[model samples]
Target: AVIAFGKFKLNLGTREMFREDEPMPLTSGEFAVLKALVSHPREPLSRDKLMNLARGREYSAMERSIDVQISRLRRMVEEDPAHPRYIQTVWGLGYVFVPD
Candidate 1:
């Protein structure tokens, strides 16, 4: 299956992402996180829920790994990571994937 948003295309079957036919390399963890977000676009998912969906495990409050991962994803998908357009933070809620 494939998910398309903006100029990016994520192929779940191959675990690959392409931006206008150009390949974008992603680590296994990154792919997992992206998949989780893309799977539920426009839906706000908490950090704990995102961790569970992406890693298939419970999230540790001490670890801010989800935030870091989201930052990395923003660097890849957003024209400007400082002012993201796709992956948006929901304040106390968590994050939401905004597809265009």
Candidate 2:
């Protein structure tokens, strides 16, 4: 299914994303982070939780690495990574996928 939000299309099944119909390539970790956010828009997922979910297990080794992936993912999914309108940091918490 292609999820249309503004100027972006998220093709979840294909694990691809498009901006104005142009294909956008994202790294594996970036794709995982975006998939998780798209799966649960408007909900906040903690850093630890997102790490586990993105990596498919406890984030024992790649816990802190989540931030890097989040930043990279935001560049692909958000209009402006610095002033994100979609995936966002949860301040003292973790991250929030705010679509609706």
Candidate 3:
């Protein structure tokens, strides 16, 4: 499956996701997290959901790393990582992907 949202495009068949001509160098963990977010666009997903669904396993350390990875992903895709557009934080809930 291929999914597009704004400049981000994920070619699942190729196991690749890119922004324009440049490929986003996502780690396996990062890819899984992004895939889960994109897969459930517009839905607020809690950290627990992200860990379980994205990582396929849950660990407290992974939970902390998820936050770091999300930050990294924002830097990768967002023009202003400080003020994100696509991957938005839903405050206390978690995150929601708003596709453009």
Top TM-score prediction, candidate number: 1
What RMSD does model 1 have?
3.3
Best by lDDT: 1
Candidate 1 per-residue lDDT, tens place, 59-90, comes to: 33224588888898899999999998989888
> Between candidates 1 and 2, which one is better according to lDDT?
1
Q: Tell me the tens digit of each residue's lDDT in model 3 across 1-100.
A: 8788778788755668778857867667777788788889999899878887776443332644778878978888889988999999998899988887
Model 3 gets an lDDT of 0.79
Cα distance off (Å), candidate 1, residue 85:
1.1
Question: Relative to the true structure, how large is the alpha-carbon lDDT of every model?
Answer: 0.82, 0.74, 0.79
Q: Give the clash count for each candidate.
A: 0, 0, 0
Scored against the true structure, residue 96 in model 3 reaches a CA lDDT of: 84
lDDT-sorted candidate list, best first: 1, 3, 2
